[PDB]
């Protein structure tokens, strides 16, 4: 199955000028835990924003143009991306906006972090129909010395 993982600020903002303005170490730890030892699919802008391969994961980059780095796998279409993952139980789609839009109709599971922060951004998580999705896990955390905003981890399954 295909899963999406994302961190959303207020109004479903996920980025600004090809960056993520906030720093929430607990959420990056959640991201690592839920993606380690799985293939991750990302768009080219997100690859540039991360700036290096994610270790312990198969990194698959969507781009219409030839690959410029052989430490990761480059593919030209959604179907090629899925095929390059091979026969694994769970494929993790890690963004950005354009890629999330394309994979949402195929996805069975969403791993969402809702961050209580207002950010002026230029990229949004797709609008998803809430009737389609059941919450199966929810965990709220207040801000602390390490994480400057409160946040909620949620896992939704397609009904
Ligand atoms: N908060 C979060 O959870 C989160 C997660 C991920 C990313 N982000 C942020 O999202 C932003 C980037 O998002 P974005 O929407 O601008 O870009 P993106 O989805 O990361 O990348 C889009 C690019 O990927 C390629 N692509 C997408 N679909 C393709 C397809 N079917 N076939 C071939 N190539 C395809 C294209 O590259 P070519 O132009 O080379 O063809 C396209 O330009 C950044 O701000 C990032 O920090 C946030
Ligand atoms: N929940 C969630 N939060 C995010 O910040 C996030 N970011 C992306 C895209 N951007 C990034 C940017 C940096 C790293 C990163 O450095 N990850 C390290 C963190 C190690 C740690 O802090 O524990 C990694 O090994 O995963 C991952 C994804 C996709 N899905 C997300 N999903
Ligand atoms: Mn197969």
Short mmCIF file of N, CA and C and ligand atoms in Angstrom, two decimals:
data_model
loop_
_atom_site.label_atom_id
_atom_site.label_comp_id
_atom_site.label_asym_id
_atom_site.label_seq_id
_atom_site.Cartn_x
_atom_site.Cartn_y
_atom_site.Cartn_z
N UNK A 1 0.81 -1.26 0.00
CA UNK A 1 0.00 0.00 0.00
C UNK A 1 0.83 1.30 0.00
N UNK A 2 0.17 2.36 -0.41
CA UNK A 2 0.77 3.69 -0.47
C UNK A 2 0.28 4.50 0.71
N UNK A 3 1.25 5.11 1.40
CA UNK A 3 1.00 6.04 2.50
C UNK A 3 1.59 7.41 2.20
N UNK A 4 0.93 8.46 2.68
CA UNK A 4 1.50 9.82 2.66
C UNK A 4 1.89 10.23 4.06
N UNK A 5 3.01 10.92 4.20
CA UNK A 5 3.40 11.49 5.46
C UNK A 5 3.70 12.96 5.23
N UNK A 6 3.21 13.80 6.12
CA UNK A 6 3.35 15.25 5.98
C UNK A 6 3.18 15.93 7.32
N UNK A 7 3.77 17.11 7.43
CA UNK A 7 3.58 18.01 8.58
C UNK A 7 2.92 19.31 8.07
N UNK A 8 1.76 19.65 8.65
CA UNK A 8 0.94 20.78 8.20
C UNK A 8 0.82 21.83 9.29
N UNK A 9 1.09 23.07 8.93
CA UNK A 9 0.81 24.19 9.81
C UNK A 9 -0.63 24.61 9.58
N UNK A 10 -1.02 25.72 10.19
CA UNK A 10 -2.36 26.23 10.00
C UNK A 10 -2.68 26.40 8.53
N UNK A 11 -3.93 26.10 8.17
CA UNK A 11 -4.41 26.29 6.78
C UNK A 11 -3.73 25.35 5.78
N UNK A 12 -3.19 24.25 6.30
CA UNK A 12 -2.58 23.19 5.49
C UNK A 12 -1.31 23.65 4.80
N UNK A 13 -0.67 24.71 5.29
CA UNK A 13 0.60 25.12 4.75
C UNK A 13 1.69 24.11 5.07
N UNK A 14 2.43 23.75 4.03
CA UNK A 14 3.57 22.84 4.17
C UNK A 14 4.93 23.38 3.75
N UNK A 15 4.98 24.55 3.12
CA UNK A 15 6.28 25.08 2.73
C UNK A 15 6.21 26.55 2.41
N UNK A 16 7.40 27.14 2.38
CA UNK A 16 7.58 28.55 1.99
C UNK A 16 8.94 28.67 1.31
N UNK A 17 8.94 29.08 0.03
CA UNK A 17 10.17 29.33 -0.75
C UNK A 17 11.07 28.12 -0.68
N UNK A 18 10.48 26.95 -0.93
CA UNK A 18 11.18 25.67 -0.93
C UNK A 18 11.85 25.27 0.35
N UNK A 19 11.34 25.81 1.45
CA UNK A 19 11.79 25.42 2.77
C UNK A 19 10.63 25.19 3.72
N UNK A 20 10.99 24.67 4.89
CA UNK A 20 10.06 24.41 5.96
C UNK A 20 10.51 25.32 7.11
N UNK A 21 9.77 26.39 7.39
CA UNK A 21 10.38 27.42 8.25
C UNK A 21 10.58 27.02 9.73
N UNK A 22 9.83 26.02 10.18
CA UNK A 22 9.80 25.68 11.60
C UNK A 22 10.89 24.64 11.90
N UNK A 23 11.13 24.41 13.18
CA UNK A 23 12.04 23.38 13.63
C UNK A 23 11.32 22.66 14.76
N UNK A 24 10.87 21.44 14.50
CA UNK A 24 10.26 20.63 15.54
C UNK A 24 10.95 19.28 15.60
N UNK A 25 11.97 19.14 16.43
CA UNK A 25 12.70 17.88 16.45
C UNK A 25 11.85 16.63 16.76
N UNK A 26 10.80 16.74 17.59
CA UNK A 26 9.96 15.58 17.89
C UNK A 26 9.26 15.07 16.62
N UNK A 27 8.90 15.99 15.72
CA UNK A 27 8.24 15.60 14.51
C UNK A 27 9.21 15.00 13.48
N UNK A 28 10.43 15.52 13.41
CA UNK A 28 11.41 14.86 12.56
C UNK A 28 11.72 13.46 13.08
N UNK A 29 11.69 13.27 14.40
CA UNK A 29 11.91 11.94 14.96
C UNK A 29 10.78 10.99 14.58
N UNK A 30 9.54 11.51 14.58
CA UNK A 30 8.38 10.75 14.15
C UNK A 30 8.51 10.39 12.67
N UNK A 31 8.96 11.34 11.87
CA UNK A 31 9.17 11.08 10.46
C UNK A 31 10.18 9.94 10.22
N UNK A 32 11.32 10.00 10.90
CA UNK A 32 12.34 8.97 10.75
C UNK A 32 11.78 7.61 11.15
N UNK A 33 11.11 7.57 12.31
CA UNK A 33 10.60 6.31 12.83
C UNK A 33 9.63 5.63 11.83
N UNK A 34 8.76 6.46 11.18
CA UNK A 34 7.73 5.92 10.30
C UNK A 34 8.21 5.69 8.86
N UNK A 35 9.39 6.18 8.51
CA UNK A 35 9.92 5.98 7.14
C UNK A 35 11.16 5.09 7.05
N UNK A 36 11.85 4.89 8.17
CA UNK A 36 13.08 4.06 8.13
C UNK A 36 12.80 2.67 7.55
N UNK A 37 13.70 2.21 6.67
CA UNK A 37 13.64 0.88 6.07
C UNK A 37 12.45 0.72 5.13
N UNK A 38 11.95 1.85 4.62
CA UNK A 38 10.90 1.85 3.61
C UNK A 38 11.35 2.71 2.45
N UNK A 39 10.80 2.46 1.26
CA UNK A 39 11.11 3.37 0.17
C UNK A 39 10.35 4.70 0.36
N UNK A 40 11.01 5.81 0.01
CA UNK A 40 10.40 7.13 0.06
C UNK A 40 10.39 7.73 -1.33
N UNK A 41 9.25 8.26 -1.74
CA UNK A 41 9.10 8.92 -3.04
C UNK A 41 8.94 10.40 -2.78
N UNK A 42 9.71 11.21 -3.50
CA UNK A 42 9.60 12.64 -3.39
C UNK A 42 9.72 13.30 -4.75
N UNK A 43 9.17 14.49 -4.84
CA UNK A 43 9.39 15.33 -6.00
C UNK A 43 10.75 16.00 -6.01
N UNK A 44 11.13 16.51 -7.17
CA UNK A 44 12.45 17.11 -7.32
C UNK A 44 12.65 18.35 -6.43
N UNK A 45 11.63 19.17 -6.25
CA UNK A 45 11.82 20.35 -5.41
C UNK A 45 12.10 19.92 -3.95
N UNK A 46 11.41 18.88 -3.49
CA UNK A 46 11.61 18.41 -2.13
C UNK A 46 12.99 17.81 -1.97
N UNK A 47 13.47 17.11 -2.99
CA UNK A 47 14.83 16.60 -3.00
C UNK A 47 15.86 17.72 -2.83
N UNK A 48 15.66 18.80 -3.54
CA UNK A 48 16.55 19.97 -3.44
C UNK A 48 16.46 20.62 -2.06
N UNK A 49 15.27 20.60 -1.48
CA UNK A 49 15.04 21.18 -0.14
C UNK A 49 15.69 20.36 0.96
N UNK A 50 15.68 19.04 0.81
CA UNK A 50 16.37 18.17 1.77
C UNK A 50 17.89 18.25 1.58
N UNK A 51 18.33 18.13 0.33
CA UNK A 51 19.70 18.41 0.00
C UNK A 51 20.67 17.25 0.13
N UNK A 52 20.20 16.06 0.47
CA UNK A 52 21.08 14.91 0.59
C UNK A 52 20.17 13.68 0.69
N UNK A 53 20.69 12.47 0.40
CA UNK A 53 19.86 11.27 0.55
C UNK A 53 19.48 11.00 1.99
N UNK A 54 18.28 10.47 2.21
CA UNK A 54 17.87 10.06 3.54
C UNK A 54 18.41 8.67 3.81
N UNK A 55 19.24 8.52 4.86
CA UNK A 55 19.85 7.19 5.05
C UNK A 55 18.88 6.10 5.50
N UNK A 56 19.14 4.88 5.09
CA UNK A 56 18.39 3.74 5.58
C UNK A 56 17.04 3.59 4.90
N UNK A 57 16.89 4.31 3.79
CA UNK A 57 15.68 4.30 2.98
C UNK A 57 16.08 4.31 1.53
N UNK A 58 15.25 3.68 0.70
CA UNK A 58 15.42 3.82 -0.75
C UNK A 58 14.79 5.15 -1.19
N UNK A 59 15.61 6.05 -1.72
CA UNK A 59 15.17 7.39 -2.12
C UNK A 59 14.84 7.41 -3.62
N UNK A 60 13.60 7.72 -3.94
CA UNK A 60 13.11 7.72 -5.31
C UNK A 60 12.61 9.13 -5.60
N UNK A 61 13.16 9.74 -6.64
CA UNK A 61 12.88 11.13 -7.00
C UNK A 61 12.14 11.20 -8.31
N UNK A 62 10.99 11.87 -8.30
CA UNK A 62 10.25 12.14 -9.54
C UNK A 62 10.74 13.40 -10.21
N UNK A 63 11.07 13.27 -11.49
CA UNK A 63 11.48 14.42 -12.28
C UNK A 63 11.25 14.08 -13.75
N UNK A 64 10.82 15.07 -14.54
CA UNK A 64 10.66 14.86 -15.99
C UNK A 64 12.00 14.80 -16.70
N UNK A 65 13.04 15.24 -16.01
CA UNK A 65 14.37 15.36 -16.59
C UNK A 65 15.36 14.38 -15.98
N UNK A 66 16.46 14.13 -16.71
CA UNK A 66 17.45 13.14 -16.29
C UNK A 66 17.98 13.38 -14.88
N UNK A 67 18.38 12.30 -14.22
CA UNK A 67 18.89 12.37 -12.88
C UNK A 67 20.26 12.96 -12.90
N UNK A 68 20.61 13.67 -11.83
CA UNK A 68 21.92 14.32 -11.69
C UNK A 68 22.68 13.82 -10.46
N UNK A 69 22.34 12.64 -9.98
CA UNK A 69 22.97 12.09 -8.75
C UNK A 69 22.64 10.61 -8.67
N UNK A 70 23.64 9.73 -8.72
CA UNK A 70 23.38 8.29 -8.73
C UNK A 70 23.27 7.65 -7.34
N UNK A 71 23.26 8.45 -6.29
CA UNK A 71 23.02 7.91 -4.95
C UNK A 71 21.53 7.70 -4.70
N UNK A 72 20.70 8.20 -5.61
CA UNK A 72 19.25 8.01 -5.48
C UNK A 72 18.67 7.50 -6.80
N UNK A 73 17.42 7.06 -6.79
CA UNK A 73 16.77 6.54 -8.00
C UNK A 73 15.87 7.58 -8.64
N UNK A 74 16.03 7.85 -9.93
CA UNK A 74 15.24 8.85 -10.63
C UNK A 74 14.24 8.17 -11.53
N UNK A 75 13.00 8.65 -11.48
CA UNK A 75 11.95 8.10 -12.30
C UNK A 75 11.14 9.23 -12.92
N UNK A 76 10.44 8.93 -14.02
CA UNK A 76 9.74 9.95 -14.81
C UNK A 76 8.22 9.97 -14.71
N UNK A 77 7.63 9.08 -13.93
CA UNK A 77 6.17 8.99 -13.84
C UNK A 77 5.79 8.32 -12.53
N UNK A 78 4.55 8.53 -12.12
CA UNK A 78 3.99 7.91 -10.92
C UNK A 78 4.09 6.38 -10.99
N UNK A 79 3.72 5.80 -12.13
CA UNK A 79 3.73 4.35 -12.25
C UNK A 79 5.17 3.79 -12.15
N UNK A 80 6.13 4.49 -12.74
CA UNK A 80 7.54 4.10 -12.64
C UNK A 80 8.03 4.21 -11.20
N UNK A 81 7.60 5.26 -10.50
CA UNK A 81 7.94 5.43 -9.10
C UNK A 81 7.48 4.26 -8.26
N UNK A 82 6.23 3.85 -8.43
CA UNK A 82 5.70 2.73 -7.66
C UNK A 82 6.48 1.44 -7.99
N UNK A 83 6.70 1.21 -9.27
CA UNK A 83 7.41 0.01 -9.71
C UNK A 83 8.84 -0.07 -9.13
N UNK A 84 9.52 1.07 -9.05
CA UNK A 84 10.89 1.09 -8.56
C UNK A 84 10.97 0.72 -7.08
N UNK A 85 9.85 0.78 -6.37
CA UNK A 85 9.82 0.42 -4.95
C UNK A 85 9.93 -1.09 -4.74
N UNK A 86 9.52 -1.84 -5.75
CA UNK A 86 9.47 -3.28 -5.65
C UNK A 86 8.31 -3.75 -4.79
N UNK A 87 8.43 -4.97 -4.28
CA UNK A 87 7.31 -5.60 -3.59
C UNK A 87 7.58 -5.40 -2.12
N UNK A 88 7.09 -4.28 -1.60
CA UNK A 88 7.24 -3.95 -0.19
C UNK A 88 5.84 -3.72 0.38
N UNK A 89 5.68 -3.86 1.71
CA UNK A 89 4.35 -3.70 2.28
C UNK A 89 3.85 -2.24 2.24
N UNK A 90 4.77 -1.30 2.40
CA UNK A 90 4.40 0.10 2.53
C UNK A 90 5.37 1.06 1.85
N UNK A 91 4.80 1.87 0.96
CA UNK A 91 5.55 2.87 0.21
C UNK A 91 5.21 4.21 0.84
N UNK A 92 6.22 4.99 1.22
CA UNK A 92 5.99 6.30 1.85
C UNK A 92 6.20 7.46 0.87
N UNK A 93 5.17 8.26 0.65
CA UNK A 93 5.27 9.43 -0.20
C UNK A 93 5.48 10.61 0.70
N UNK A 94 6.59 11.33 0.48
CA UNK A 94 7.03 12.37 1.39
C UNK A 94 6.96 13.80 0.79
N UNK A 95 6.19 13.98 -0.30
CA UNK A 95 5.91 15.31 -0.81
C UNK A 95 6.74 15.71 -2.02
N UNK A 96 6.67 16.96 -2.47
CA UNK A 96 5.90 18.03 -1.84
C UNK A 96 4.48 18.15 -2.36
N UNK A 97 3.99 19.39 -2.47
CA UNK A 97 2.58 19.60 -2.78
C UNK A 97 2.08 18.89 -4.05
N UNK A 98 2.80 19.07 -5.15
CA UNK A 98 2.40 18.48 -6.41
C UNK A 98 2.40 16.97 -6.33
N UNK A 99 3.39 16.40 -5.68
CA UNK A 99 3.45 14.93 -5.53
C UNK A 99 2.35 14.41 -4.61
N UNK A 100 2.08 15.09 -3.50
CA UNK A 100 0.99 14.65 -2.64
C UNK A 100 -0.36 14.60 -3.41
N UNK A 101 -0.59 15.60 -4.29
CA UNK A 101 -1.86 15.67 -5.06
C UNK A 101 -2.03 14.45 -5.91
N UNK A 102 -0.92 14.03 -6.53
CA UNK A 102 -0.97 12.89 -7.43
C UNK A 102 -1.14 11.54 -6.73
N UNK A 103 -0.57 11.41 -5.54
CA UNK A 103 -0.65 10.13 -4.82
C UNK A 103 -1.83 9.99 -3.87
N UNK A 104 -2.49 11.08 -3.47
CA UNK A 104 -3.59 11.00 -2.53
C UNK A 104 -4.72 10.03 -2.97
N UNK A 105 -5.15 10.05 -4.25
CA UNK A 105 -6.20 9.11 -4.70
C UNK A 105 -5.81 7.63 -4.58
N UNK A 106 -4.51 7.33 -4.59
CA UNK A 106 -4.01 5.96 -4.45
C UNK A 106 -3.74 5.53 -3.00
N UNK A 107 -3.69 6.49 -2.10
CA UNK A 107 -3.24 6.24 -0.75
C UNK A 107 -4.27 5.56 0.15
N UNK A 108 -3.79 4.68 1.02
CA UNK A 108 -4.62 4.01 2.02
C UNK A 108 -4.46 4.60 3.42
N UNK A 109 -3.40 5.37 3.65
CA UNK A 109 -3.02 5.77 5.00
C UNK A 109 -2.34 7.13 4.90
N UNK A 110 -2.68 8.02 5.84
CA UNK A 110 -2.05 9.35 5.98
C UNK A 110 -1.48 9.48 7.37
N UNK A 111 -0.22 9.84 7.43
CA UNK A 111 0.47 10.13 8.67
C UNK A 111 0.64 11.64 8.70
N UNK A 112 -0.17 12.32 9.52
CA UNK A 112 -0.20 13.79 9.51
C UNK A 112 0.20 14.34 10.85
N UNK A 113 1.08 15.32 10.83
CA UNK A 113 1.37 16.12 12.01
C UNK A 113 0.72 17.49 11.85
N UNK A 114 -0.15 17.87 12.78
CA UNK A 114 -0.78 19.18 12.74
C UNK A 114 -0.02 20.05 13.70
N UNK A 115 0.61 21.09 13.18
CA UNK A 115 1.40 21.99 13.96
C UNK A 115 0.63 23.27 14.24
N UNK A 116 0.56 23.63 15.52
CA UNK A 116 -0.14 24.87 15.91
C UNK A 116 0.76 26.09 15.66
N UNK A 117 0.98 26.41 14.39
CA UNK A 117 1.81 27.53 14.00
C UNK A 117 1.22 28.15 12.73
N UNK A 118 1.25 29.48 12.68
CA UNK A 118 0.79 30.24 11.52
C UNK A 118 2.05 30.62 10.73
N UNK A 119 2.04 30.22 9.47
CA UNK A 119 3.16 30.40 8.57
C UNK A 119 2.57 30.86 7.25
N UNK A 120 3.22 31.87 6.69
CA UNK A 120 2.83 32.39 5.40
C UNK A 120 3.58 31.52 4.42
N UNK A 121 2.84 30.68 3.71
CA UNK A 121 3.44 29.75 2.79
C UNK A 121 2.86 29.80 1.40
N UNK A 122 3.54 29.09 0.51
CA UNK A 122 3.20 29.07 -0.89
C UNK A 122 2.88 27.66 -1.37
N UNK A 123 2.89 26.70 -0.45
CA UNK A 123 2.57 25.32 -0.79
C UNK A 123 1.69 24.75 0.28
N UNK A 124 0.68 24.02 -0.18
CA UNK A 124 -0.36 23.44 0.68
C UNK A 124 -0.48 21.94 0.49
N UNK A 125 -0.89 21.28 1.56
CA UNK A 125 -1.27 19.88 1.45
C UNK A 125 -2.62 19.88 0.73
N UNK A 126 -2.88 18.87 -0.11
CA UNK A 126 -4.15 18.84 -0.84
C UNK A 126 -5.34 18.81 0.10
N UNK A 127 -6.43 19.36 -0.41
CA UNK A 127 -7.68 19.35 0.28
C UNK A 127 -8.17 17.91 0.18
N UNK A 128 -8.41 17.29 1.31
CA UNK A 128 -8.91 15.93 1.32
C UNK A 128 -10.29 15.89 1.98
N UNK A 129 -11.15 15.03 1.44
CA UNK A 129 -12.52 14.90 1.90
C UNK A 129 -12.52 14.12 3.23
N UNK A 130 -12.88 14.78 4.33
CA UNK A 130 -12.78 14.11 5.63
C UNK A 130 -13.67 12.88 5.78
N UNK A 131 -14.77 12.80 5.02
CA UNK A 131 -15.63 11.61 5.09
C UNK A 131 -14.94 10.34 4.66
N UNK A 132 -13.89 10.51 3.85
CA UNK A 132 -13.15 9.37 3.28
C UNK A 132 -12.21 8.69 4.26
N UNK A 133 -11.97 9.29 5.42
CA UNK A 133 -10.84 8.91 6.26
C UNK A 133 -11.28 8.72 7.70
N UNK A 134 -10.78 7.66 8.31
CA UNK A 134 -11.01 7.31 9.70
C UNK A 134 -9.75 7.54 10.49
N UNK A 135 -9.86 8.24 11.61
CA UNK A 135 -8.72 8.39 12.52
C UNK A 135 -8.52 7.15 13.35
N UNK A 136 -7.32 6.58 13.29
CA UNK A 136 -7.03 5.39 14.07
C UNK A 136 -5.96 5.60 15.12
N UNK A 137 -5.36 6.78 15.15
CA UNK A 137 -4.36 7.10 16.17
C UNK A 137 -4.25 8.60 16.24
N UNK A 138 -4.19 9.12 17.46
CA UNK A 138 -4.09 10.53 17.67
C UNK A 138 -3.29 10.72 18.96
N UNK A 139 -2.36 11.66 18.96
CA UNK A 139 -1.53 11.92 20.15
C UNK A 139 -1.12 13.38 20.16
N UNK A 140 -1.57 14.12 21.18
CA UNK A 140 -1.30 15.54 21.27
C UNK A 140 -0.13 15.83 22.22
N UNK A 141 0.67 16.83 21.87
CA UNK A 141 1.83 17.21 22.65
C UNK A 141 1.89 18.72 22.79
N UNK A 142 2.03 19.21 24.02
CA UNK A 142 2.25 20.63 24.24
C UNK A 142 3.68 21.02 23.84
N UNK A 143 3.91 22.31 23.62
CA UNK A 143 5.23 22.84 23.37
C UNK A 143 6.10 22.58 24.59
N UNK A 144 7.40 22.50 24.35
CA UNK A 144 8.37 22.29 25.41
C UNK A 144 9.66 22.98 25.02
N UNK A 145 10.74 22.75 25.77
CA UNK A 145 11.98 23.48 25.53
C UNK A 145 12.58 23.16 24.20
N UNK A 146 12.25 21.99 23.66
CA UNK A 146 12.86 21.55 22.40
C UNK A 146 11.94 21.85 21.21
N UNK A 147 10.62 21.89 21.47
CA UNK A 147 9.63 22.00 20.38
C UNK A 147 8.76 23.20 20.65
N UNK A 148 8.98 24.25 19.88
CA UNK A 148 8.39 25.54 20.22
C UNK A 148 6.90 25.71 19.97
N UNK A 149 6.25 24.74 19.33
CA UNK A 149 4.81 24.78 19.10
C UNK A 149 4.20 23.46 19.54
N UNK A 150 2.93 23.46 19.89
CA UNK A 150 2.25 22.22 20.17
C UNK A 150 1.94 21.57 18.83
N UNK A 151 1.71 20.28 18.87
CA UNK A 151 1.57 19.48 17.66
C UNK A 151 0.79 18.23 18.01
N UNK A 152 0.17 17.65 17.00
CA UNK A 152 -0.67 16.48 17.15
C UNK A 152 -0.25 15.51 16.06
N UNK A 153 0.04 14.27 16.43
CA UNK A 153 0.33 13.22 15.48
C UNK A 153 -0.97 12.50 15.24
N UNK A 154 -1.31 12.29 13.97
CA UNK A 154 -2.51 11.57 13.62
C UNK A 154 -2.25 10.56 12.52
N UNK A 155 -2.89 9.41 12.59
CA UNK A 155 -2.82 8.43 11.49
C UNK A 155 -4.24 8.20 11.03
N UNK A 156 -4.50 8.41 9.75
CA UNK A 156 -5.82 8.20 9.17
C UNK A 156 -5.76 7.06 8.18
N UNK A 157 -6.81 6.25 8.15
CA UNK A 157 -6.94 5.14 7.19
C UNK A 157 -8.12 5.43 6.31
N UNK A 158 -7.97 5.15 5.02
CA UNK A 158 -9.08 5.34 4.10
C UNK A 158 -10.22 4.36 4.42
N UNK A 159 -11.45 4.87 4.54
CA UNK A 159 -12.57 4.07 4.99
C UNK A 159 -13.04 3.10 3.97
N1 LIG B 1 5.70 19.97 5.58
C1 LIG B 1 5.82 18.78 4.84
O1 LIG B 1 5.34 17.77 5.24
C2 LIG B 1 6.54 18.84 3.52
C3 LIG B 1 6.86 17.66 2.84
C4 LIG B 1 7.49 17.70 1.64
C5 LIG B 1 7.82 18.92 1.07
N2 LIG B 1 7.51 20.08 1.73
C6 LIG B 1 7.77 21.39 1.12
O2 LIG B 1 6.98 21.42 -0.26
C7 LIG B 1 7.63 22.27 -1.10
C8 LIG B 1 7.95 21.57 -2.42
O3 LIG B 1 6.69 21.22 -2.88
P1 LIG B 1 6.34 21.46 -4.44
O4 LIG B 1 4.84 21.21 -4.70
O5 LIG B 1 6.86 22.81 -4.91
O6 LIG B 1 7.27 20.41 -5.29
P2 LIG B 1 7.46 18.81 -5.23
O7 LIG B 1 6.15 18.13 -5.31
O8 LIG B 1 8.44 18.39 -4.19
O9 LIG B 1 8.25 18.60 -6.59
C9 LIG B 1 7.61 18.89 -7.86
C10 LIG B 1 8.52 18.43 -8.98
O10 LIG B 1 8.58 17.09 -8.96
C11 LIG B 1 8.53 16.56 -10.45
N3 LIG B 1 7.32 15.84 -10.57
C12 LIG B 1 6.19 15.85 -9.84
N4 LIG B 1 5.33 14.96 -10.36
C13 LIG B 1 5.90 14.40 -11.47
C14 LIG B 1 5.45 13.47 -12.38
N5 LIG B 1 4.26 12.78 -12.46
N6 LIG B 1 6.26 13.08 -13.37
C15 LIG B 1 7.50 13.63 -13.49
N7 LIG B 1 7.96 14.56 -12.61
C16 LIG B 1 7.14 14.95 -11.60
C17 LIG B 1 8.65 17.64 -11.23
O11 LIG B 1 10.08 17.89 -11.39
P3 LIG B 1 10.71 18.50 -12.74
O12 LIG B 1 10.39 20.00 -12.73
O13 LIG B 1 12.18 18.23 -12.69
O14 LIG B 1 10.00 17.81 -13.83
C18 LIG B 1 8.05 18.82 -10.42
O15 LIG B 1 8.57 20.03 -10.76
C19 LIG B 1 8.86 22.78 -0.31
O16 LIG B 1 8.49 23.98 0.29
C20 LIG B 1 9.02 21.68 0.77
O17 LIG B 1 9.79 22.29 1.91
C21 LIG B 1 6.85 20.05 2.92
N1 LIG B 2 5.82 14.68 9.67
C1 LIG B 2 6.69 15.18 8.71
N2 LIG B 2 7.54 16.18 9.11
C2 LIG B 2 8.45 16.75 8.25
O1 LIG B 2 9.19 17.64 8.63
C3 LIG B 2 8.46 16.19 6.88
N3 LIG B 2 9.36 16.68 5.94
C4 LIG B 2 9.35 16.18 4.76
C5 LIG B 2 10.31 16.69 3.73
N4 LIG B 2 11.49 17.28 4.29
C6 LIG B 2 12.42 16.68 5.12
C7 LIG B 2 13.40 17.48 5.61
C8 LIG B 2 14.43 16.93 6.53
C9 LIG B 2 14.38 15.63 6.88
C10 LIG B 2 15.41 15.01 7.81
O2 LIG B 2 16.47 15.57 8.03
N5 LIG B 2 15.14 13.77 8.37
C11 LIG B 2 16.11 13.08 9.16
C12 LIG B 2 15.82 13.46 10.61
C13 LIG B 2 16.61 12.76 11.68
C14 LIG B 2 15.94 13.07 13.02
O3 LIG B 2 15.71 14.25 13.36
O4 LIG B 2 15.58 12.15 13.81
C15 LIG B 2 15.83 11.63 8.88
O5 LIG B 2 16.76 10.80 8.97
O6 LIG B 2 14.67 11.25 8.60
C16 LIG B 2 13.30 14.75 6.35
C17 LIG B 2 12.35 15.24 5.52
C18 LIG B 2 8.37 15.11 4.42
N6 LIG B 2 7.54 14.67 5.29
C19 LIG B 2 7.58 15.21 6.58
N7 LIG B 2 6.68 14.71 7.51
MN1 LIG B 3 4.77 -6.09 -8.17
#
